[PDB]
Amino acid sequence: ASRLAGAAADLVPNIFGFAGGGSRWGAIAEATGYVMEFSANVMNTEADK
Amino acid sequence: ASRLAGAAADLVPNIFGFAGGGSRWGAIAEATGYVMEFSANVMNTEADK
Amino acid sequence: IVKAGGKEQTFTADKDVSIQPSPSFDEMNYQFNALEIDGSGLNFINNSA
Amino acid sequence: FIDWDKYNKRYSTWAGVSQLVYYPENYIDPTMRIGQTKMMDALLQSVSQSQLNADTVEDAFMSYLTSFEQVANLKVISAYHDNINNDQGLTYFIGLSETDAGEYYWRSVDHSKFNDGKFAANAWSEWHKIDCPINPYKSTIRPVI
Amino acid sequence: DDVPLNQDYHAKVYMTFKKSPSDGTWWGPHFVRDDKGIVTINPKSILTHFESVNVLNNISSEPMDFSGANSLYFWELFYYTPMLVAQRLLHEQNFDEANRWLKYVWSPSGYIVHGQIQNYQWNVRPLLEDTSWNSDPLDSVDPDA
Amino acid sequence: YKSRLYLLWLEQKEITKQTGYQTETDYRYELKLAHIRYDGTWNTPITFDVNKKISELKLEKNRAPGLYCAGYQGEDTLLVMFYNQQDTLDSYKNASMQGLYIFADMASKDMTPEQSNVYRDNSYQQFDTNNVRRVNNRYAEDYEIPSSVSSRKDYGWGDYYLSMVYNGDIPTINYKAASSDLKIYISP
Amino acid sequence: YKSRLYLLWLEQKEITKQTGYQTETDYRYELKLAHIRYDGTWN
Amino acid sequence: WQSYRTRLNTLFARQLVARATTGIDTILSMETQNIQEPQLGKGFYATFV
Numbered sequence: 001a002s003r004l005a006g007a008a009a010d011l012v013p014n015i016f017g018f019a020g021g022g023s024r025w026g027a028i029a030e031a032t033g034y035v036m037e038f039s040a041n042v043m044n045t046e047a048d049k
Numbered sequence: 050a051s052r053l054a055g056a057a058a059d060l061v062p063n064i065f066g067f068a069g070g071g072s073r074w075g076a077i078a079e080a081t082g083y084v085m086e087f088s089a090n091v092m093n094t095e096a097d098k
Numbered sequence: 099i100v101k102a103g104g105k106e107q108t109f110t111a112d113k114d115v116s117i118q119p120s121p122s123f124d125e126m127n128y129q130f131n132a133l134e135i136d137g138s139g140l141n142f143i144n145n146s147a
Numbered sequence: 148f149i150d151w152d153k154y155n156k157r158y159s160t161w162a163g164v165s166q167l168v169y170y171p172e173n174y175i176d177p178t179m180r181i182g183q184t185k186m187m188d189a190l191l192q193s194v195s196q197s198q199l200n201a202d203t204v205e206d207a208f209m210s211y212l213t214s215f216e217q218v219a220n221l222k223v224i225s226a227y228h229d230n231i232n233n234d235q236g237l238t239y240f241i242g243l244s245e246t247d248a249g250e251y252y253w254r255s256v257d258h259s260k261f262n263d264g265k266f267a268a269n270a271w272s273e274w275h276k277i278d279c280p281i282n283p284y285k286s287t288i289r290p291v292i
Numbered sequence: 293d294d295v296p297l298n299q300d301y302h303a304k305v306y307m308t309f310k311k312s313p314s315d316g317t318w319w320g321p322h323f324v325r326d327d328k329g330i331v332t333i334n335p336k337s338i339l340t341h342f343e344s345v346n347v348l349n350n351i352s353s354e355p356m357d358f359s360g361a362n363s364l365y366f367w368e369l370f371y372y373t374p375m376l377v378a379q380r381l382l383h384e385q386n387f388d389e390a391n392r393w394l395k396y397v398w399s400p401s402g403y404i405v406h407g408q409i410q411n412y413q414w415n416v417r418p419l420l421e422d423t424s425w426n427s428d429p430l431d432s433v434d435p436d437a
Numbered sequence: 438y439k440s441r442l443y444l445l446w447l448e449q450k451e452i453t454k455q456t457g458y459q460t461e462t463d464y465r466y467e468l469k470l471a472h473i474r475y476d477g478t479w480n481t482p483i484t485f486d487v488n489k490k491i492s493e494l495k496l497e498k499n500r501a502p503g504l505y506c507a508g509y510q511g512e513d514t515l516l517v518m519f520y521n522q523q524d525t526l527d528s529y530k531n532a533s534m535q536g537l538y539i540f541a542d543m544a545s546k547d548m549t550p551e552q553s554n555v556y557r558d559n560s561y562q563q564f565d566t567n568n569v570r571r572v573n574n575r576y577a578e579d580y581e582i583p584s585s586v587s588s589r590k591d592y593g594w595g596d597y598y599l600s601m602v603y604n605g606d607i608p609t610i611n612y613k614a615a616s617s618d619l620k621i622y623i624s625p
Numbered sequence: 626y627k628s629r630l631y632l633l634w635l636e637q638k639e640i641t642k643q644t645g646y647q648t649e650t651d652y653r654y655e656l657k658l659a660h661i662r663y664d665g666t667w668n
Numbered sequence: 669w670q671s672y673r674t675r676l677n678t679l680f681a682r683q684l685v686a687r688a689t690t691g692i693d694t695i696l697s698m699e700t701q702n703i704q705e706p707q708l709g710k711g712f713y714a715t716f717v
Contacts, residue, residue: 001246002082005481006075008248011282017453017460019068027075028248029280036278038086045093046192050668062451065641066648067460069453102621120344120717127715129350130625132611137619154433167435174435177379180372181434187368187376194380201389204377208692209475212684215369216475219362219681222542233669240676245543246481256361256674260427266674268363268425294710305716323714331712343717350608350624351713353704362678370701396696403698408591410698411603417701440686458645475688541682588699 007031056080103139103147184273186214218274220245221252227290228258235259239290242274251277253290300324301334307341321345358418359425367425370416371397438508438515439541443472444479445506445517447487466491468517470539483543487519490535490547494521502535503565505556509576511584515539516556516576518548522567529561582612582621631660632667673708680705 007027015022024030056076064071073079100107111118111128119126140147154160167174178191193207221242230236235258242252252274260270281288296302306320320341322334331347339345358366374396381390396415403410414420429437446469454463468485494502505518518536523529534557536548548556559578563571587606594601609624634657642651659667680703687700694700707713 001481002078004248006078009075014072015070017068132622132624135621137621171435177375180436199384213475216681223676267427268359271361346715348713353706356705440689
């Protein structure tokens, strides 16, 4: 939930004025990758339990 | 404390002039996620102790 | 039988049901009409009756 | 004779299969099940240790119930029906979770298992989580086979 | 429908059996719905094949379906999760805690809800009402199916 | 909201309007809503664009709007209302409200002005003033009666245990509250 | 301050004023304040 | 489908929150399994005896 909330916030633009944009377009793909890499750590943690 | 201080500093804009902004909007959510992922490492470290 | 406060009100299916159910040992459903209950007389104890 | 090498060649495998229509409960495991979801597998792992306190078991149940709530509140966006006409084949649905940067799910239903005005319960598949980075505009998203 | 095909009657239900395997003109309840949401039966209908037909106007909801689309998740919540936990607590010799999880499915002593014993014995509703949720159990050799 | 803890906070972002030659700092507003889950963790916050509503409140600069947020059992909805904070509660009796509904599926819907005046009149005494921070109660107007009752409190068997009166309900409960009398209409 | 060690430092950020045609480098200032905790870490 | 309406979602988890505020005993009870699901569009219920 923390990593999906950060992906949703990085898709809105943060540069305004005569230049616009700044949306991190790969934010959902980066968030999905972090959750999968963390799920691998949890499965090793759960197996060690 | 190090990760919350970095989230507070990345929410202020760092682009000025005729274009404005540059605030990392997902900075608190990214900082909360790093603290939780690090807390998982500490609990494995504490359990190994 | 509706006990709402002081005096009780008795509603009966001969007067207050439009369509009588068929006789059955399985199930007899008596759908009453909108029965009007006087609520003036409810004793509110801790704001609730 | 198709089922020879697995079932009918030996009396043991024959008696195991023949009894299974009459006494399945001899072979039912409360732990293992064919068709068991990933929710139940994660639940089984959460209680697969020696020291099961009442509070340990309760916390494993509320973690299960959290992931139960997530697939229960899926909103169906769009669908695709695989055959050229509605009566046969499969319909594939797309679900959306109730999160911002939402998650997408898919499931299918088999129209051949529609019988007497009602889908059989085994016509439906599980919701399957889609791992792709999906961000549609105004929910303009469609499955297709 | 939002707009009916027939103004005289908005829906027609009828009954077929061996002696009368056919549709008939006015030979079932023909339902008519007003501008207000009251559904009533058109009195020109012949209700001979039925004992009675009753429209339930105050009812706008039905109980949850243990044979519907989400029947797998409902059976996992109310049956398979207390069975998996009680089996797992029994293996760990936690007998008092294993007992209360078996009683989430079946209390042989009954159920007391706010100081009154209840009528039912099986705490899972599709075990009271024997609700089949697999129409094809012999496709494969699954004891659970 | 529906016996679950929800957090609802207003969040500000500064944007940059162009005014050409020059450009200008400007602010926009959004409403975030998060809830707790069964295992104690919190869901992702859901964003609601309220920037048009904060603008209709003619707020002074660097001043937050008042925020009313309350649950409401009849018509299951989260009532969220915005208001320009005043000094006294009696200034709220004719104040304009920028309200919106929030439903269970996080769909939102704006309140019409005649609709939020009703929620204003029954809850303005819970609004914050400039010096007093007040706590919101859940919303009601003079009574809180369930719309239907489906669970019994008690049952009993018939004589000789041959029958029972059982699995009934009251699927429709209405009430008409006037001055000094209450008329409850049940359809059991 | 109240028998706890505090650090207090001035910190500078450069911003960019617009002067329209052109623009101009400008500085703004902020005061940071941190204190030590019981376990030796800093807030 | 042609004249049929097949329910796709459930609102069980929307109403489970009220049942779940007071423990697993209330979640796994018979009253929780009588949580009702709304009707599918325009129509009515009818009892055929």
